């Protein structure tokens, strides 16, 4: 009765401290045998080298789950796709630590991928909650033409159609285009002036520059900005009055690992105590049979829910994303991020700090407005 867990972590010191955390998890009184063995490997820049290392080290060591964290370089995407596909070939579940990309939500691509961090598409729920409390009846979405962007747009439309309301129009941006002046010019002649932005950092900076040069950041306009579109170079181009979102300790790898090790330990205990199980294949070479207990492990992970984590209660939906996550509403004042609101799930609680708006106005502006110029 030996259960092994693999880990793909950014730095050696993090690997050692998380192995120590796994050992501490093994110090529980209800655990007897070796239910959590610690194996770690650094993120190799080469994709096929990483796949070979995983196939030769983790799968060969009878891993029940693999933990993959953020790459050491946030500038590069460095997606965990190479290990996710290999794990999904054998139906071996994985627990993404801080992978916020909205590509693994669909399990038809990543069969056995799970993550404890909500994706960028999940911010549509927070946007809907903010709209329901600030009376943003009319909205306009500026979303780039990307799979993450398409998923976010679909989720936003699905949540908005519940109130029998729809956005005026939706514009698509190419992933890397520069001449976005026409889209903003045609979006200016709209009754609604509450803009939600969902794009990349460079695209967000380009949109900010285009709005600044077209005087689109004046009084009355409200800009809703996600987590990705404020971080990085956007701080040097975002105008005042940005209503941005930020994930509480979202990039904190230590807390996510500490929660994930306990969650996976409890899941392993439940799976072992549930019924008869099938051992993982000893070698990754020459075997074309999926794990029989893989779907059962995924089901028990989905059904798992524990509040012992330092980041609040940890639970997974049918799409493998965290439910009831904590968001912090950030308002850009004097080119500095100010925490002005919190989001504990389906509820927005503003703080005592005043909320400024683009154009220098302090009073809360209206949303949809008329121009009395009817074509």
């Amino acid at each position, epitope marked *: 009765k030996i259960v092994n867990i693999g880990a793909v972590l950014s730095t050696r010191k993090h690997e050692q401290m998380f192995r*120590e955390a796994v*050992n*501490q*998890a093994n*110090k529980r*009184h*209800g655990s*007897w045998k070796i239910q959590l063995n610690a194996t770690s490997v650094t993120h190799k820049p080469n994709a096929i080298q990483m796949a070979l290392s995983v196939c030769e080290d983790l799968i060969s060591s009878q891993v029940y789950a693999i933990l993959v964290s953020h790459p050491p370089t946030p500038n590069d995407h460095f997606t965990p796709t190479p290990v996710s596909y290999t794990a999904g070939f054998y139906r071996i579940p994985v627990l993404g630590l801080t992978t916020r990309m909205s590509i693994y939500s669909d399990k038809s691509i990543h069969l056995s991928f799970l993550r404890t961090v909500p994706p960028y598409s999940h911010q549509s729920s927070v946007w809907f909650e903010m709209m329901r409390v600030y009376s943003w009846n009319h909205i306009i979405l500026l979303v780039s033409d990307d799979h993450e962007g398409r998923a976010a747009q679909k989720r936003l439309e699905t949540l908005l159609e519940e109130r029998e309301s729809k956005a005026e129009k939706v514009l698509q941006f190419d992933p890397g285009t520069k001449n976005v002046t026409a889209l903003l010019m045609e979006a200016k002649e709209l009754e609604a002036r509450v803009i939600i932005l969902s794009a990349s950092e460079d695209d967000a900076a380009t949109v900010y520059r285009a709005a600044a040069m077209l005087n689109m950041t004046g009084s009355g306009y409200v800009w809703l900005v996600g987590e990705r579109e404020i971080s990085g170079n956007a701080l040097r181009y975002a105008p005042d009055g940005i209503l941005g979102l930020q994930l509480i300790n979202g990039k904190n790898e230590s807390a996510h690992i*500490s929660d994930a090790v306990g969650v996976v330990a409890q899941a392993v205990h439940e799976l072992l105590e549930k019924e008869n199980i099938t051992d993982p294949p000893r070698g990754c070479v020459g075997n074309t049979n999926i794990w029989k207990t893989g779907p059962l492990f995924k089901r028990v992970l989905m059904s798992s829910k524990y509040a012992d984590g330092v980041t609040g209660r940890v639970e997974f939906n049918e799409d493998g994303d965290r439910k009831f996550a904590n968001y912090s509403i950030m308002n850009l004042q004097n080119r500095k991020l100010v925490q002005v609101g919190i989001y504990n799930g389906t509820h927005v609680i503003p703080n005592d700090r005043k909320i400024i708006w683009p154009g220098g106005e302090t009073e809360k502006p209206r949303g949809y407005q008329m121009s009395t110029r009817l074509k």
Partner: antibody
Amino acid sequence: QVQLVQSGAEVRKPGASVKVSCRASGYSFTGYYVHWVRQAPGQGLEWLGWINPNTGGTDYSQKFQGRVTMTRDTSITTAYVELSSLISDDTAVYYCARDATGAASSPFDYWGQGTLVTVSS
Amino acid sequence: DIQMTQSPSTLSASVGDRVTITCRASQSISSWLAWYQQRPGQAPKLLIYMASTLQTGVPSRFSGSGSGTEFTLTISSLQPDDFATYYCQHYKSYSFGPGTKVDIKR
């Protein structure tokens, strides 16, 4: 020198809350577990739980769940345990012991002098 | 979990007499058992860890044997300071037995 200092004897009415401290010196406080074991008179040792100062993880016995709270402070290397809903059977002596981190072959190498808690009307 | 049973409940012997304590667990625990000595009004002291190796500073008279579910504590010569209660505890259950107390025969 490895030494453990606890609080003095306290008497509390039933249904109240009692807090017991445990100060460690002479070794890495974060690098060793702190375990709380009680012993009623005329009865053997009874285990309550343990706290890891390095990560703050708290483990509690299923019998004592919902009443035992353990906190640690790295700045002063002191551990505190809080117990609520005291009953007549809770009158015992509480001891804090040291356990090695990662190694599972050194059970309670050192023991403190113990703190006596009396529950009566 | 795992329940620890100690036998005999009470043992009385003269000074220098051999002392044998038998402790049994509910199921197999391999060799993860430890023996403690606790005098009345005093904190417990660890004598043998892992039931095979003696703790540093413990007199050589104490010895441990057994494996699996049955473990035996053996004292070659009883001493006046050895009149205390002995407990057997498993590592990953933190469960202590009822305790065997050595008293002067009378």
